[PDB]
RNA sequence: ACGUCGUCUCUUCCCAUCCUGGCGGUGCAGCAGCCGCCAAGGGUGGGGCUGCCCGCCCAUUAAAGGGGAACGUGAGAUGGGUUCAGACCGUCGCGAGACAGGUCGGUCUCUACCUGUCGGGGGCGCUGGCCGCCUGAGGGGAAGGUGCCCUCAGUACGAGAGG
RNA sequence: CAAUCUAAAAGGGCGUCCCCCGCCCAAGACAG
């Protein structure tokens, strides 16, 4: 994988129909809802805390996934699974690609250069817009501090500035 | 611990330099043995320039005529007698009829029990235990 | 190497009583919550043991 | 930077490689001495030749202490000082330079040193030492003009050579002056200014060599494998990279010896009041005889064998003194 | 924050003499004389302004942000340790500790010299500043007396740390597995007044 | 038409520091080791193998750092490799031929015009000419760098070994 | 005192200036 900064931008179109595009790769992402999910269960939780993005860019699946790790394995061992309600709010339906030489991937991925240069599938992303929710979390007002602290941890994986907002349901 | 030699070490002339090879002046076994190394604070050198020693310094060698089972195994000796003039500080120059080493451990134990032909002053006042079987000293 | 109370009691305030910052290495109060070079706050306490 | 490391090849404390601009040299730094009473602080010789002696080693320390070791000797041929003028230094309150105020000469210089100096038939020292008695309450340094006495020398040669020499040895202006004045027309020996056993410092032009090689001048290697090379072997390979250009560091043949040098530490064996004593019966090869003072000098000097040598108090001595006691110079290779 | 004027006052107590000199535009010199001495401090450059009323240092602020407001509370330290340097003095207490080579302390003349230190040839020397008496109270105890408390802590603070070591001879505070380690030195441990 | 790899020679610069200087932490007892910070004044070497560069290795060593300068420097060298014409092998090609696969052989041109640098001379000026002795703005410097032995002491430390 | 044009990020800092919110103190708050 190159480093996230070459994906980081939005450059161009969305690259999501799947009818069209060969090869594209599946979604990494087991679960993107975790905790107490069962709705009647989520009626005792009162806050709402949102980790908000703060510019607009794309970011990619094994961000999210490792943002979505470790922000669960620590509400998990401080609050507890039945006390919290966290889910990963967007999908990364953008296909990344990547103009590099390579066999057993078609016979114009084997042309050196910028000659024929669209992209082999290389990755997903989620395109995001400044003030889009990426993750969402609900949770019981005793647990301020840990939830605050679990979405610290995840902004630390992800590839934009990022805000944490906490309001009531 | 043990007997200490002098603190000091002049110049002296080096007469011997890497791959010499040089006659063996004990019943050690060894009988030539070929220079591949100086020790101490004066084997540093300088970009080009052969490291050299003279009587009194301890070098790296490799026995190359002898006994069969010292053949191609590597020993420290000291040098005790120098074909090349030197100038002793008190202003004398000296000069032997052959270059001549002396096995020893690293720590300057000699491996044989006699030492044949005169030793250089400079070797027995280092190295006590050389002086202690030098019949001759000059 | 022991030492009567009195004295083991200096030597622990002089020599086991600060806090070092993992940031910058810097020294620091015992009590202190900022690092006094560099103002971070990852600072570690220094311990005496047994 | 270089394929495999090592130092440059000679120094660049000493450009430029220049001939000296006087054949007599002319010396930057005089030290301040504590002696206890008004003296010189250096004296002027002629280089005459070199020996070998034998002589006690008397530093208790020392591995050869007590032996008889054989040192490397050089002799300076050393005919009394004649002193000409005296002259006061103040300084200048606008940047602090130091600068003569005036000078005070003898009545009637001798006539030796009119072939250097354009002179009056005389001198009115009493006006010139009044003037200069104006000039005490900011005096900061007090200087006499010696003129050495060639003739007296194995050179025997007529002209002059004329120098500045201070005094020093107690912290009081006023004394130094005094002492100065006392001086004006008198004659200085080697014993008034050194002890036999002192450090000495050294300083003269070294010998010429003319033009010489980068392999001599600088020390640059050979080029290895000396036959292979096309357009000679003594020389430098490149004279420097693309940029800068050719920089002043670069190692270029030129002018070799004629420098002036100071040398320090120089050990005095021997103050002699006859150089009979010490002239092989040969005569010093290329100088001739020594029949006055010589000062017998442990080591070596700077200069050809005619040179005029300025030795001073040292300005760098080491920490530990030598002996009290003169050294024991039991014999010299000049004696049967 | 902003501060549009701030006063602060400091009691001169009884037999205490204070002068006031302004020797520059924000410069001033302190002189206070006491039954034990005279003290003189500099306060250079300084937005404080210093006056006497009737018995009392006045020092004032005007226009002040916090860092020149932040000096009224340090002019009335320093000038109470003042103060009480002229009347009661400042003795500064110093504790020899030694695991196995004994310390040898000793003043000569205006010299401190320690001996023996971690069994060390060389001698520890310091020189004891004017206004500054040294005494050794037995084996175990160093005293430091005077009247300008920033001079006498200075000079205590100097003995400390001439008894620290540093770089390749610092020697490991803690002992194998933990216990106490190789701590010999002077350490101060604390101060009080003369009377 | 800007001489194509490496090496030699020679100079300088960078610091993201291998040693040398300073300091701190340690799962730092000592002996050693590991980690971080300041710091580029000096040092960073000798050999075996290969055309090498790189790398592996040998004996030392305080340590045997890494980079830039038209991949510094062929009107300075060298010419082993690569990369002309001859030839052999393997493979490919019906063939002539081909291969950045291996192999043997294979012209390194120039009187230096300018500038630069290094040293050496003549003059004019410096407020009339000249002689001698001085001053010191500035300029150059690495002019010094770095080890070992004894003592301390078989001491501190340590259960001992060690140190 | 724009751009060509020689720059800077995630992150850390009550370093300092400032704005807002919650709570305690009705002089029995914070610090000893
Ligand atoms: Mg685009
Ligand atoms: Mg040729
Ligand atoms: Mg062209
Ligand atoms: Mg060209
Ligand atoms: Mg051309
Ligand atoms: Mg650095
Ligand atoms: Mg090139
Ligand atoms: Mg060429
Ligand atoms: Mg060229
Ligand atoms: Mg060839
Ligand atoms: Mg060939
Ligand atoms: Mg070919
Ligand atoms: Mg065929
Ligand atoms: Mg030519
Ligand atoms: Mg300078
Ligand atoms: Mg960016
Ligand atoms: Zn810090």
Same mark, same amino acid.
């Given at each position: 994988?190159?480093?996230?900064?070459?994906?980081?931008?939005?450059?161009?179109?969305?690259?999501?129909?799947?009818?069209?595009?060969?090869?594209?790769?599946?979604?990494?992402?087991?679960?993107?809802?975790?905790?107490?999910?069962?709705?009647?269960?989520?009626?005792?939780?009162?806050?709402?805390?949102?980790?908000?993005?703060?510019?607009?860019?794309?970011?990619?699946?094994?961000?999210?996934?490792?943002?979505?790790?470790?922000?669960?394995?620590?509400?998990?061992?401080?609050?507890?699974?039945?006390?919290?309600?966290?889910?990963?709010?967007?999908?990364?339906?953008?296909?990344?690609?990547?103009?590099?030489?390579?066999?057993?991937?078609?016979?114009?991925?084997?042309?050196?250069?910028?000659?024929?240069?669209?992209?082999?599938?290389?990755?997903?992303?989620?395109?995001?817009?400044?003030?889009?929710?990426?993750?969402?979390?609900?949770?019981?007002?005793?647990?301020?501090?840990?939830?605050?602290?679990?979405?610290?941890?995840?902004?630390?994986?992800?590839?934009?500035?990022?805000?944490?907002?906490?309001?009531?349901? | 611990?043990?007997?200490?030699?002098?603190?000091?070490?002049?110049?002296?002339?080096?007469?011997?330099?890497?791959?010499?090879?040089?006659?063996?002046?004990?019943?050690?076994?060894?009988?030539?043995?070929?220079?591949?190394?100086?020790?101490?604070?004066?084997?540093?050198?300088?970009?080009?320039?052969?490291?050299? !020693?003279?009587?009194?310094?301890? @070098? &790296?060698? /490799?026995?190359? +005529? #002898?006994? %069969?089972?010292?053949?191609?195994?590597?020993?420290?000796?000291?040098?005790?007698?120098?074909?090349?003039?030197?100038?002793?500080?008190?202003?004398?120059?000296? !000069?032997?009829?052959?270059?001549? @080493? &002396?096995? /020893?451990?690293? +720590? #300057?134990? %000699?491996?044989?029990?006699?030492?044949?032909?005169?030793?250089?002053?400079?070797?027995?006042?280092?190295?006590?235990?050389?002086?202690?079987?030098?019949?001759?000293?000059? | 190497?022991?030492?009567?109370?009195?004295?083991?009691?200096?030597?622990?305030?002089?020599?086991?009583?600060?806090?070092?910052?993992?940031?910058?290495?810097?020294?620091?109060?015992?009590?202190?919550?900022?690092?006094?070079?560099?103002?971070?706050?990852?600072?570690?306490?220094?311990?005496?043991?047994? | 930077?270089?394929?495999?490391?090592?130092?440059?090849?000679?120094?660049?404390?000493?450009?430029?490689?220049?001939?000296?601009?006087?054949?007599?040299?002319?010396?930057?730094?005089?030290?301040?001495?504590?002696?206890?009473?008004?003296?010189?602080?250096?004296?002027?010789?002629?280089?005459?030749?070199?020996?070998?002696?034998?002589?006690?080693?008397?530093?208790?320390?020392?591995?050869?202490?007590?032996?008889?070791?054989?040192?490397?000797?050089?002799?300076?041929?050393?005919?009394?000082?004649?002193?000409?003028?005296?002259?006061?230094?103040?300084?200048?309150?606008?940047?602090?330079?130091?600068?003569?105020?005036?000078?005070?000469?003898?009545?009637?210089?001798?006539?030796?040193?009119?072939?250097?100096?354009?002179?009056?038939?005389?001198?009115?020292?009493?006006?010139?030492?009044?003037?200069?008695?104006?000039?005490?309450?900011?005096?900061?340094?007090?200087?006499?003009?010696?003129?050495?006495?060639?003739?007296?020398?194995?050179?025997?040669?007529?002209?002059?050579?004329?120098?500045?020499?201070?005094?020093?040895?107690?912290?009081?202006?006023?004394?130094?002056?005094?002492?100065?004045?006392?001086?004006?027309?008198?004659?200085?020996?080697?014993?008034?200014?050194?002890?036999?056993?002192?450090?000495?410092?050294?300083?003269?032009?070294?010998?010429?060599?003319?033009?010489?090689?980068?392999?001599?001048?600088?020390?640059?290697?050979?080029?290895?494998?000396?036959?292979?090379?096309?357009?000679?072997?003594?020389?430098?390979?490149?004279?420097?990279?693309?940029?800068?250009?050719?920089?002043?560091?670069?190692?270029?043949?030129?002018?070799?010896?004629?420098?002036?040098?100071?040398?320090?530490?120089?050990?005095?064996?021997?103050?002699?009041?006859?150089?009979?004593?010490?002239?092989?019966?040969?005569?010093?090869?290329?100088?001739?005889?020594?029949?006055?003072?010589?000062?017998?000098?442990?080591?070596?000097?700077?200069?050809?064998?005619?040179?005029?040598?300025?030795?001073?108090?040292?300005?760098?001595?080491?920490?530990?003194?030598?002996?009290?006691?003169?050294?024991?110079?039991?014999?010299?290779?000049?004696?049967? | 924050?902003?501060?549009?004027?701030?006063?602060?006052?400091?009691?001169?107590?009884?037999?205490?003499?204070?002068?006031?000199?302004?020797?520059?535009?924000?410069?001033?010199?302190?002189?206070?004389?006491?039954?034990?001495?005279?003290?003189?401090?500099?306060?250079?450059?300084?937005?404080?302004?210093?006056?006497?009323?009737?018995?009392?240092?006045?020092?004032?602020?005007?226009?002040?942000?916090?860092?020149?407001?932040?000096?009224?509370?340090?002019?009335?330290?320093?000038?109470?340790?003042?103060?009480?340097?002229?009347?009661?003095?400042?003795?500064?207490?110093?504790?020899?500790?030694?695991?196995?080579?004994?310390?040898?302390?000793?003043?000569?003349?205006?010299?401190?010299?320690?001996?023996?230190?971690?069994?060390?040839?060389?001698?520890?020397?310091?020189?004891?500043?004017?206004?500054?008496?040294?005494?050794?109270?037995?084996?175990?105890?160093?005293?430091?007396?005077?009247?300008?408390?920033?001079?006498?802590?200075?000079?205590?603070?100097?003995?400390?740390?001439?008894?620290?070591?540093?770089?390749?001879?610092?020697?490991?505070?803690?002992?194998?597995?933990?216990?106490?380690?190789?701590?010999?030195?002077?350490?101060?441990?604390?101060?009080?007044?003369?009377?």
């Amino acid at each position: 994988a190159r480093p996230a900064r070459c994906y980081r931008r939005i450059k161009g179109p969305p690259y999501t129909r799947e009818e069209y595009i060969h090869g594209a790769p599946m979604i990494q992402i087991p679960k993107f809802d975790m905790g107490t999910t069962s709705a009647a269960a989520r009626a005792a939780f009162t806050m709402v805390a949102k980790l908000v993005a703060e510019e607009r860019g794309q970011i990619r699946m094994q961000a999210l996934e490792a943002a979505r790790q470790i922000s669960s394995k620590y509400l998990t061992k401080y609050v507890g699974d039945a006390n919290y309600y966290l889910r990963l709010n967007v999908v990364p339906h953008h296909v990344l690609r990547e103009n590099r030489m390579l066999a057993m991937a078609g016979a114009d991925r084997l042309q050196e250069g910028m000659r024929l240069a669209f992209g082999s599938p290389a990755g997903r992303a989620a395109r995001v817009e400044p003030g889009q929710v990426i993750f969402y979390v609900e949770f019981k007002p005793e647990h301020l501090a840990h939830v605050k602290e679990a979405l610290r941890r995840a902004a630390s994986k992800l590839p934009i500035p990022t805000r944490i907002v906490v309001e009531p349901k | 611990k043990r007997t200490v030699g002098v603190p000091y070490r002049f110049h002296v002339t080096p007469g011997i330099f890497m791959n010499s090879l040089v006659p063996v002046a004990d019943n050690s076994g060894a009988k030539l043995v070929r220079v591949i190394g100086v020790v101490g604070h004066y084997s540093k050198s300088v970009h080009r320039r052969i490291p050299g !020693a003279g009587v009194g310094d301890m @070098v &790296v060698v /490799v026995v190359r +005529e #002898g006994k %069969p089972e010292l053949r191609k195994q590597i020993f420290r000796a000291i040098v005790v007698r120098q074909r090349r003039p030197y100038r002793r500080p008190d202003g004398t120059w000296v !000069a032997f009829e052959d270059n001549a @080493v &002396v096995i /020893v451990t690293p +720590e #300057g134990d %000699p491996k044989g029990s006699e030492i044949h032909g005169p030793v250089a002053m400079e070797a027995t006042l280092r190295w006590p235990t050389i002086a202690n079987l030098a019949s001759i000293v000059v | 190497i022991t030492l009567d109370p009195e004295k083991l009691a200096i030597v622990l305030q002089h020599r086991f009583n600060y806090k070092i910052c993992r940031n910058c290495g810097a020294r620091n109060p015992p009590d202190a919550e900022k690092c006094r070079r560099c103002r971070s706050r990852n600072l570690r306490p220094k311990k005496f043991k047994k | 930077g270089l394929k495999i490391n090592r130092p440059r090849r000679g120094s660049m404390g000493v450009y430029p490689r220049k001939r000296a601009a006087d054949i007599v040299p002319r010396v930057r730094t005089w030290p301040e001495v504590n002696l206890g009473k008004p003296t010189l602080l250096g004296f002027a010789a002629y280089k005459a030749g070199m020996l070998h002696a034998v002589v006690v080693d008397d530093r208790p320390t020392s591995p050869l202490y007590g032996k008889e070791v054989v040192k490397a000797v050089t002799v300076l041929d050393a005919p009394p000082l004649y002193v000409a003028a005296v002259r006061l230094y103040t300084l200048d309150p606008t940047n602090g330079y130091k600068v003569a105020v005036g000078e005070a000469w003898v009545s009637e210089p001798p006539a030796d040193l009119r072939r250097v100096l354009t002179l009056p038939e005389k001198f009115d020292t009493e006006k010139q030492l009044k003037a200069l008695e104006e000039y005490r309450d900011v005096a900061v340094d007090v200087r006499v003009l010696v003129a050495t006495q060639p003739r007296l020398s194995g050179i025997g040669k007529k002209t002059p050579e004329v120098l500045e020499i201070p005094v020093g040895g107690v912290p009081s202006i006023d004394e130094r002056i005094n002492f100065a004045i006392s001086l004006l027309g008198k004659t200085v020996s080697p014993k008034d200014v050194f002890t036999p056993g002192q450090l000495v410092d050294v300083i003269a032009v070294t010998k010429g060599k003319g033009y010489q090689g980068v392999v001599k001048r600088f020390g640059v290697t050979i080029l290895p494998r000396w036959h292979k090379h096309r357009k000679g072997h003594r020389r430098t390979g490149t004279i420097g990279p693309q940029a800068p250009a050719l920089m002043f560091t670069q190692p270029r043949p030129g002018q070799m010896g004629f420098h002036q040098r100071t040398e320090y530490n120089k050990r005095i064996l021997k103050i002699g009041d006859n150089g009979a004593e010490i002239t092989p019966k040969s005569g010093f090869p290329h100088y001739g005889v020594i029949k006055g003072p010589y000062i017998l000098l442990q080591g070596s000097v700077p200069g050809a064998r005619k040179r005029l040598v300025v030795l001073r108090y040292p300005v760098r001595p080491p920490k530990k003194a030598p002996p009290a006691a003169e050294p024991q110079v039991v014999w010299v290779s000049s004696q049967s | 924050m902003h501060v549009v004027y701030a006063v602060e006052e400091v009691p001169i107590p009884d037999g205490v003499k204070v002068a006031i000199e302004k020797t520059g535009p924000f410069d001033y010199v302190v002189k206070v004389k006491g039954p034990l001495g005279e003290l003189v401090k500099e306060f250079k450059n300084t937005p404080v302004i210093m006056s006497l009323s009737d018995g009392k240092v006045v020092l004032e602020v005007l226009n002040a942000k916090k860092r020149e407001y932040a000096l009224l509370g340090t002019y009335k330290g320093i000038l109470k340790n003042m103060f009480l340097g002229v009347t009661k003095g400042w003795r500064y207490k110093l504790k020899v500790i030694y695991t196995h080579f004994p310390m040898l302390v000793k003043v000569q003349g205006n010299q401190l010299t320690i001996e023996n230190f971690l069994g060390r040839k060389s001698k520890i020397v310091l020189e004891i500043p004017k206004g500054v008496k040294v005494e050794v109270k037995g084996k175990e105890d160093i005293v430091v007396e005077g009247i300008d408390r920033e001079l006498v802590s200075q000079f205590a603070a100097a003995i400390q740390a001439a008894t620290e070591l540093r770089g390749e001879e610092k020697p490991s505070p803690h002992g194998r597995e933990g216990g106490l380690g190789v701590v010999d030195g002077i350490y101060v441990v604390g101060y009080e007044h003369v009377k």
